[PDB]
Amino acid sequence: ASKTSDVAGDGTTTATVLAQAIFNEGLRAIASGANPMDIKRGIDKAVETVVNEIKKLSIPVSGRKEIEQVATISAN
Amino acid sequence: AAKKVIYGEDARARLKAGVDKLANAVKVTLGPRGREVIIEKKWGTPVVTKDGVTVAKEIEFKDPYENMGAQLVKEVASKTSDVAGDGTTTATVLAQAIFNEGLRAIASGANPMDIKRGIDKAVETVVNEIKKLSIPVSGRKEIEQVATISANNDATIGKIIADAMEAVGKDGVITVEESKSAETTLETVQGMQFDRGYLSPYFVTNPDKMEAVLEDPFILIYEKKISNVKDLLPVLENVVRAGKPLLIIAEDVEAEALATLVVNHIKGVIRACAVKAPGFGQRRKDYLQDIAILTGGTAITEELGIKLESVTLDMLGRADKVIVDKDNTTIVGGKGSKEAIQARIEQIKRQILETTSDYDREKLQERLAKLSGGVAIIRVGAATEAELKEKKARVEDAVHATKAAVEEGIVPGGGVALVRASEALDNLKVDNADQQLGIDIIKKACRTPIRQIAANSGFEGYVVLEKVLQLGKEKGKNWGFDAGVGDYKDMVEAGIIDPTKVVRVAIQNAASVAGTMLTAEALVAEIPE
Amino acid sequence: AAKKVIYGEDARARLKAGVDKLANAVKVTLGPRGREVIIEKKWGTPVVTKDGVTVAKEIEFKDPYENMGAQLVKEVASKTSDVAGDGTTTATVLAQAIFNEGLRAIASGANPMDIKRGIDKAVETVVNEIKKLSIPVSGRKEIEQVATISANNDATIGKIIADAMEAVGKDGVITVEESKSAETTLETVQGMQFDRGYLSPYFVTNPDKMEAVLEDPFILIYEKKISNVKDLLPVLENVVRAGKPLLIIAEDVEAEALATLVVNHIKGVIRACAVKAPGFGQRRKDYLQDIAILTGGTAITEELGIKLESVTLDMLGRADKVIVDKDNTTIVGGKGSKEAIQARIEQIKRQILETTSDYDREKLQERLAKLSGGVAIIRVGAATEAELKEKKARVEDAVHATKAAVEEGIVPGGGVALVRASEALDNLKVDNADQQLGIDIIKKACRTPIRQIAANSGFEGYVVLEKVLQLGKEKGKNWGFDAGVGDYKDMVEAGIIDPTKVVRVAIQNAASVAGTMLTAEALVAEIPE
Numbered sequence A: 001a002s003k004t005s006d007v008a009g010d011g012t013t014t015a016t017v018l019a020q021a022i023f024n025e026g027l028r029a030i031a032s033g034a035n036p037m038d039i040k041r042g043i044d045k046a047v048e049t050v051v052n053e054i055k056k057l058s059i060p061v062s063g064r065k066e067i068e069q070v071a072t073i074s075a076n
Numbered sequence B, C: 001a002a003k004k005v006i007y008g009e010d011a012r013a014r015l016k017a018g019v020d021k022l023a024n025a026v027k028v029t030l031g032p033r034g035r036e037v038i039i040e041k042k043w044g045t046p047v048v049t050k051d052g053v054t055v056a057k058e059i060e061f062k063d064p065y066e067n068m069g070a071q072l073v074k075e076v077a078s079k080t081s082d083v084a085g086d087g088t089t090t091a092t093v094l095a096q097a098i099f100n101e102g103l104r105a106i107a108s109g110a111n112p113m114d115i116k117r118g119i120d121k122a123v124e125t126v127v128n129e130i131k132k133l134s135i136p137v138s139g140r141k142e143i144e145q146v147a148t149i150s151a152n153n154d155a156t157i158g159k160i161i162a163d164a165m166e167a168v169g170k171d172g173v174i175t176v177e178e179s180k181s182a183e184t185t186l187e188t189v190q191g192m193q194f195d196r197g198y199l200s201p202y203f204v205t206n207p208d209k210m211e212a213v214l215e216d217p218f219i220l221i222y223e224k225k226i227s228n229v230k231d232l233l234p235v236l237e238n239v240v241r242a243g244k245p246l247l248i249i250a251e252d253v254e255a256e257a258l259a260t261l262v263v264n265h266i267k268g269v270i271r272a273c274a275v276k277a278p279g280f281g282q283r284r285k286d287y288l289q290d291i292a293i294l295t296g297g298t299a300i301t302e303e304l305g306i307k308l309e310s311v312t313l314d315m316l317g318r319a320d321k322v323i324v325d326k327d328n329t330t331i332v333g334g335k336g337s338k339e340a341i342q343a344r345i346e347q348i349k350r351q352i353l354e355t356t357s358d359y360d361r362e363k364l365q366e367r368l369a370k371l372s373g374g375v376a377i378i379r380v381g382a383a384t385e386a387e388l389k390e391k392k393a394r395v396e397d398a399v400h401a402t403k404a405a406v407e408e409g410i411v412p413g414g415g416v417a418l419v420r421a422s423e424a425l426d427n428l429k430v431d432n433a434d435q436q437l438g439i440d441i442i443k444k445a446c447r448t449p450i451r452q453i454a455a456n457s458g459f460e461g462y463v464v465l466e467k468v469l470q471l472g473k474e475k476g477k478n479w480g481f482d483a484g485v486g487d488y489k490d491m492v493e494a495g496i497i498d499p500t501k502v503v504r505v506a507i508q509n510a511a512s513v514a515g516t517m518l519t520a521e522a523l524v525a526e527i528p529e
């Protein structure tokens, strides 16, 4: 949560929710006998793919319409 | 009374502690070189055992909830011996392994219901692999080996059982007796054993199994249904006056008054028995009249002129011992002259060629074997009552286990069978992740008994297990670890083999109780004091 | 004795803890795949059950105030089974849901009296929807399905009940018996059923459900009022000498002395019972004389010249068993010759034409139906006597539950019926805010049993509930979740159906006890020394 706030200023609750999900599912895999170091290597590969996919969905801000929409959503 | 209820994870925590305390005491005695367990005997010297069954008999805990787990595993493990004659300690070891690993998976968030489905599927695959691996018993060589291994690796009982088995036949009848003589011997006393039930459950004499056993009894045999009680009272009273028991052989008895009155009048004293007829048809008389003349008695009916008003204690059939089961009856010995009895056997010898019914020809040549070969009575002998008691149940379990080997086959012992069977789980696959966990639980459990045997002997369990797995491909499926001497060899050739029913029942029984306790949600017990 | 009183919120806090401890132990066994509950049996192996009724019977707490809540819910839940056969666990689950949510609303400041008014109003709407959703039973298909679900999903018991139902008719009388045989069979005995009960309350015997049972009784038939006991004594003393109980069928007994001398004079012996003469009008004798000859006897009257001081026991009627309810009486079957009895049926068959009045002609061809169809005796067998007690209770309840289905209809099982009924509460509206809270309490409660069934089988309760709500309009009202196999299907076609009496009574009973405890203001109990 601290790093997310420093870098982006928003999404700290989403980052915390994501972190718990990765850790909880990782423990289940490790309890089945998986190698902890290989799981981390697999996680790193998946995040690289996921970040690439997100940039594909990214649409540049055209003007005031998206600026108002982003501000409204982030302000609850 | 007031009761305390424990729910959820706390309930299974109580069970795990109770099962562990039971298993940790018993598993140290597994194998041929099990460690010693010392049991207190009040006002006596402590007893040192490596038996496992003896250890499990004394185990009982103060905590009612921990006692719940111990008794549940004890009963299920005891049922393994009641069906197969062996495997009580192995079933307990397997039960702890499945339960402990099952709780670990649930603690990680796995679905308990899906784990049981994986366990059920894995057990089915393991049982099928055991069926493929087992080989039928061929002769005296394997029967002696099974009896020796079923006992505590004592070849004396193994030889006696093998001799007794080959005497009465591969599927005959064996019984165990005792004497004050230090030596033990096998006597082929003539008798028979057929699947006949008894007329009323009220003939219980001594066994808690609601069965009946008789010593030096007098046999009444009838070709038709039981007559009135007043016709039997001159026999019921005078023979009791004479100080000997009685039993009545007849087709049927009325349960309204005849069944109740006969036992009620004799309930306060030695009591008597009554049994049914074998098979069906008029050829019952072929068995009935022979047993009447082979035991020195007569078959009584008013159509033969034997009036019930003038019954005399001398028409009774006489034999050495009679044992009545729930569905079977066996009679040992006979007080008549053996030459005339064997002369009356010639009728059965001629009945081989003269009878025209297949249903009796199927039981023919068995009416001879139990008589001509004699019902095998093992006369166990020991120098002390304590040793006599120990060896007495020791022989019957070995006899029962040997019969189980004939019925279903033999498999390499020392836990090799479960190791080989667990290799099939390496390729069994399911679409559910939690069910896969259940499969891996059984694979780990199947490889525990071999590790415990190696550990008890003084070797590292995982090192032994790895080499046994390697020898499965390098040498063969039957190669394993000989804990008696400490080297790897072919277990079947060495004679270290187990009945395949023992391995099959133990894993099935252990998985059933473990699965039951894995989904237990509440424990209800009274508050102490 | 000195007593301690608890007032206000503290009193309801005690009740909530007691109800929760009862419900949490029982609700885990709800559904076809309920979890295991392990019950201590002192000097025995612990008992493992998924029954719920068995668990509830054993629950009792040390704290007198927490025990108050457990016993109150237990009695109300037990009355559901006593009236509709099934539903004991469901009523307990509903009671906890209503009580817990009711306490939450009160803790927020809502008026408890207005909450109760909302609860009663909401229950009435739910009950009406249940009746609207039910469909009448049409034939053997639904009868067999209901009996199977009422039992532990065992088709063997369902088939026997279905066969017994069609043999005797849907309005006959059925009873459960046992024998030594392990297998279970159906016996159609030459019996009959009537609609008049006992004459005195002291005749009620031992059984917990207060249904008096008599074994091997003799029958006396009177055409008028009973005479003095001095005439009865020669019969009574001789019948006592015969060693069997005696039954008197007559019109009335004088209450001044006879109503006490009839019972008091025999309280120290085998005892006897008397039953009202059934029927009306002159056909009473036809109801008596025909039945007397069906039971192998004829009527007796002092004024007819047959003095009771001279009657003979062979002249009296005899039957296998006689069963009498508070408002009804039945005879299992006469001990006379069946051929003559079936010949005597013509005398009742001729009553279709040889009798004029139509008042009992409605009961005619039903007395024939009670004769031609007999009375069904379910001979239950089990591997052991302890298991016989378990099986006998379930079969009797399944018969009772099946009869409830005929009376009122059937609804889709698995809690779907309550889910469908709860949807009407979405449009029910009231002008009081607190009464609206009571309505929403019932809506939440009605959707709890389906979630518990899904949770026990290993699925998320709210996910299952949400999809069942969706399938209510995508597919139909009868669509629900099958817990035996985890997929959604039409419940009525699948045979997963419940008697609509069970669902109706359970919600009505649960709301009554919950409403009682919501406004309880004081608890009075003795100080435990």
Ligand SMILES: Nc1ncnc2c1ncn2[C@@H]1O[C@H](COP(=O)(O)OP(=O)(O)NP(=O)(O)O)[C@@H](O)[C@H]1O
Pocket (backbone or CB within 6 Å): B029, B030, B031, B032, B034, B051, B052, B053, B081, B085, B086, B087, B088, B089, B090, B091, B149, B153, B412, B413, B414, B415, B453, B481, B482, B483, B484, B485, B496, B497, B498
């Ligand atoms: N020489 C041996 N080397 C290796 N394993 C052996 C040897 N002799 C016996 N075994 C195995 O050890 C086990 C028997 O030990 P035992 O302590 O009798 O176990 P159990 O039969 O489960 N318990 P019980 O009911 O008391 O006989 C079996 O798996 C045998 O196959």
Ligand SMILES: Nc1ncnc2c1ncn2[C@@H]1O[C@H](COP(=O)(O)OP(=O)(O)NP(=O)(O)O)[C@@H](O)[C@H]1O
Pocket (backbone or CB within 6 Å): C029, C030, C031, C032, C034, C051, C052, C053, C054, C081, C085, C086, C087, C088, C089, C090, C091, C149, C153, C412, C413, C414, C415, C453, C481, C482, C483, C484, C485, C496, C497, C498
């Ligand atoms: N295969 C099934 N799938 C879904 N629900 C089922 C199934 N079989 C039965 N049910 C439902 O489960 C409930 C029966 O479970 P049970 O444990 O007998 O509850 P009860 O009848 O309230 N308790 P008891 O009095 O002990 O029988 C009913 O609501 C049935 O409709």
Ligand SMILES: [K+]
Pocket (backbone or CB within 6 Å): B029, B030, B031, B032, B033, B034, B050, B051, B052
């Ligand atoms: K041992």
Ligand SMILES: [K+]
Pocket (backbone or CB within 6 Å): C029, C030, C031, C032, C033, C034, C050, C051, C052
């Ligand atoms: K159940």
Ligand SMILES: [Mg+2]
Pocket (backbone or CB within 6 Å): A010, A011, A074
């Ligand atoms: Mg934000």
Ligand SMILES: [Mg+2]
Pocket (backbone or CB within 6 Å): B086, B087, B149, B150
């Ligand atoms: Mg052994």
Ligand SMILES: [Mg+2]
Pocket (backbone or CB within 6 Å): C086, C087, C149, C150
């Ligand atoms: Mg039920």
